Amino acid sequence: SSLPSLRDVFANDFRIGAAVNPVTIEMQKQLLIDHVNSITAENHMKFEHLQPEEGKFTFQEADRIVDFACSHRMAVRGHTLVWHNQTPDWVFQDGQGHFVSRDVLLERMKCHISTVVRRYKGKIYCWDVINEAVADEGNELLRPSKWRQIIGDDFMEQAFLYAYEADPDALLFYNDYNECFPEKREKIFALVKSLRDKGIPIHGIGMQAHWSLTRPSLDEIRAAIERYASLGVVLHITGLDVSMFEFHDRRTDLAAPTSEMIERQAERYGQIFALFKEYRDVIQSVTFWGIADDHTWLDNFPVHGRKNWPLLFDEQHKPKPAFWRAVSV
Ligand SMILES: O[C@@H]1[C@@H](O)[C@H](O[C@@H]2CO[C@@H](O[C@@H]3CO[C@@H](O[C@@H]4CO[C@@H](O[C@@H]5CO[C@@H](O[C@@H]6CO[C@H](F)[C@H](O)[C@H]6O)[C@H](O)[C@H]5O)[C@H](O)[C@H]4O)[C@H](O)[C@H]3O)[C@H](O)[C@H]2O)OC[C@H]1O
Q1: For residue 242, is it within any domain?
Q2: How far apart are CA 108 and CA 115, in angstroms?
Q3: GH10 domain: which residues (predicted)?
């Protein structure tokens, strides 16, 4: 009540978002209403939750998310159309269980993108069209995937063009994680630059920002922002969280964060939002992958069955020390 509202604090800088589903919308309703002006579906706008079988569209959960957002004047980011994960097997198969033609996968991709994007036209202002296509390791530019396998390397071009035709007023994003590690950063840059150079309607890069207390460094975040902004795209931070564990830290028996963890996280969040505010001219939206520590996918990834404390509010929805540093930049 005397607490500052995130969206108001950053009114002149960027929207503040949260990834939700119908359960967490209920469980965290007041936090969302008090703090965010933007909503993303954590799972219920992915392919498997929209077209689980060919011709069977299940919009019910996505609809509730959108209805919530509209009834509280929140923008909506659509997530996500084309991705190597959470896409049912039928998409790539024929009756015989073999892989489909390039042309058949294109028709399925187009049908899906047109049905989904047209339904929410005028309520969803941007879409993560392509998710995580760039390789996370090695020196190949692109990760392997059945989309890429079957269609070829121009599947991303096609997807953006399909999405643009379905709603040409939407901002279309390439979305990815580890976006600030230099070698991956240069792949993302090179990929997006190539698409823009062919006139493909890609308007933005989504920086997932699934970050740790240490990685990436502030200098790596700054360099990535400037590298991407130089392409003329808009930047969204799309899944911000700050894990208490580094990647190598697979501990399962921490029942609570240490006070050192909590303190360093507050500092880390303060520094990060200072950096975001500095680049307010190119960052238009900052979405957390959740909103309070009672729900986070980091509880079970990358270690199943533990607990993480990655967000600005604790499990009782009370502001953490990271909250105070974040709003005071
Ligand atoms: O049934 C369960 C589901 O309910 C649940 O579904 C959902 C899964 O998706 C979640 O939303 C996702 C989360 O964010 C994005 O996907 C993530 C992106 O982060 C990746 O993790 C990175 C892996 O790589 C690490 O880097 C190391 C560096 O060291 C080496 F060089 C290695 O080469 C690298 O591996 C990074 O540190 C990690 O962050 C994940 O692989 C990827 O999945 C999506 O945009 C977004 O949709 C939902 O929240 C969650 O509910 O989970 C699945 C199922 O069990």
Answers
A1: yes
A2: 11
A3: 1-329
Q: Give me 168's structure tokens.
A: 């040409």
* Cα 263 from Cα 272, distance rounded (Å): 14
- Ligand 1 and 58: CB distance under 6 A: no
List Cα–Cα distances, 47 to 20, 129, 237, 256, in angstroms.
16, 11, 22, 35
Q: What is the resolution of this structure in A?
A: 2.4
Ligand 1 neighbourhood includes 250 CB (under 6 angstroms) = no
Which ligand 1 atom is nearest residue 239's CA?
14
Residue 241 CB less than 6 A away from ligand 1: no
Domain count, the chain: 1
CA 151 distance to own-chain centroid: 24
Experiment used for this model: X-ray
Q: What is the Cα–Cα distance from 203 to 205, expressed in whole angstroms?
A: 7
CATH number at residue 136: 3.20.20.80
Asked if residue 184 belongs to a domain, the reply is yes
CA distance 236 to 217: 19
Q: What is the best residue among 136, 143, 249 to mutate for testing ligand 1's pocket, by most ligand atoms within 8 Å of CB? A: 136
Ligand 1 centroid, distance to 69 Cα (angstroms): 25
Q: Which domain holds residue 52?
A: 6-326
